[PDB]
């Protein structure tokens, strides 16, 4: 969770890979923005 000032491209998204089709590691790539300036609030908890 990031209530922080940054610019979003015309099509933000995420890149996911499955670690040799194991479906266990389930990593992600943060291709959603390119800045984190004037970042105010943050929050972390169990994934929804």
């Amino acid at each position, epitope marked *: 969770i990031k209530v922080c000032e940054f610019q979003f491209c015309n099509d933000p998204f995420l890149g996911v*890979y499955y670690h040799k089709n194991n479906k266990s590691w389930m990593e992600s790539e943060f291709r959603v923005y390119s800045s984190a300036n004037n970042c105010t609030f943050e929050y972390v908890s169990q994934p929804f």
Partner: antibody
Amino acid sequence: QVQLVQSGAEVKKAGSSVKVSCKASGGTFSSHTITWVRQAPGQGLEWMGRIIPILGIANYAQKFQGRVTITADKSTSTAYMELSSLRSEDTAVYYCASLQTVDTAIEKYYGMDVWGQGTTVTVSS
Amino acid sequence: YELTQPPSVSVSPGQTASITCSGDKLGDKYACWYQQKPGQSPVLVIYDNKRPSGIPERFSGSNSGNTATLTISGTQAMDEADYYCQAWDSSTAVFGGGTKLTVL
């Protein structure tokens, strides 16, 4: 898109500090982990390490432990390293490549998408 | 972790060439094969035998339990290059000796 153009061949004396760098001039400096690999004649390819610009975490190779000081700054949009204690046998052609990702564990889900022309180095003694 | 391969391989043009990159527990390790031509920089051609677009459909293969194989189809004169098989093992990359393809 990225080109990873760099300087040409350089001539220097043996035992002196070696400085090389690769500059993109194309796509964003960040968002693409930069890797360097050494090409030598009849000796295969040698891997030294990698540095992620945005993350700032640099990984070293087993053989290059402590002989390289890799640094990268986003403001300058350039990646460079300092090399010393280099012998004539270590002379070879150095290459720089990207990975398209800036995550430590994601690098295995990618390859060397783009390479450099190769900057040969000659040692004079 | 350690890669050993034959120093060189020879095959007639237009034939199917099989290249073996033997190692120690390289199954489920994402082995990648690169191509370097004389006078040209290395390029990406494989990343499970998976070929990037814009590359002619000549490179293919399969990953067995403890061996990786590359199959070449429609070999031509311009295929003179050196193939290096590497993988991201223990957060590190290891480069093999490589094989030089010879065409009569």
